[PDB]
Amino acid sequence: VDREQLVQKARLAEQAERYDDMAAAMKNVTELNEPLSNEERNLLSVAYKNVVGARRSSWRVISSIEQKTSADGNEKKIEMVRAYREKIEKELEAVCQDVLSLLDNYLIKNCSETQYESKVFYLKMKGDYYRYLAEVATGEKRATVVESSEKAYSEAHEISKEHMQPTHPIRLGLALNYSVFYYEIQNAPEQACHLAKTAFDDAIAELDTLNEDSYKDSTLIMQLLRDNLTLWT
């Protein structure tokens, strides 16, 4: 099967809302050891974001019932909810370590050191899926995936501050998720607000650098930064 056919199947799987097949198709494209275009980069991201997103929503629903059923005391019913919450947990973790495998072995590796837009994209993507692992992890297992998530984000933030425009959608989106990581995972609203506000201030200071094409995506992320700021302060 040709590479163009795999990308066509991914676009076809997207319209048919079959996001599991879309991820398998874009994984096959990734495994060709060739770099991904800006379109194929978003196709892979959209696919796995929907696959892991479906199991993120299921876990939060079951985990909430698990904390709600703990007052029942029925050991036969509590162990059944605990086992189900664990099964969705394993599926969520397998998807994450699948994306991290593609990122470390193929995507970030085959990234030319001169292409900073893709390196920041993949490093942010790497920090996203380690954050999804920390959403369901406890104890030292959580401390490990939190440390890995901070490392991928911090490495992406330093590259974006030196070779990318403050109004670039990828640098803006990275600071949005990074600030969310400090708020939802580390519970640091002061650190979350300082990062979200700084990226908002840097973009405003260089608002003339808004690209004639990507300004629509840049302004939406800037709105999301102030929406989180007003929500956290």
Binding site: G173, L176, V180
Partner: peptide, 6 residues
């Protein structure tokens, strides 16, 4: 509330 990028 999952205030991340969509």
């Amino acid at each position: 509330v999952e205030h991340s990028l969509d």
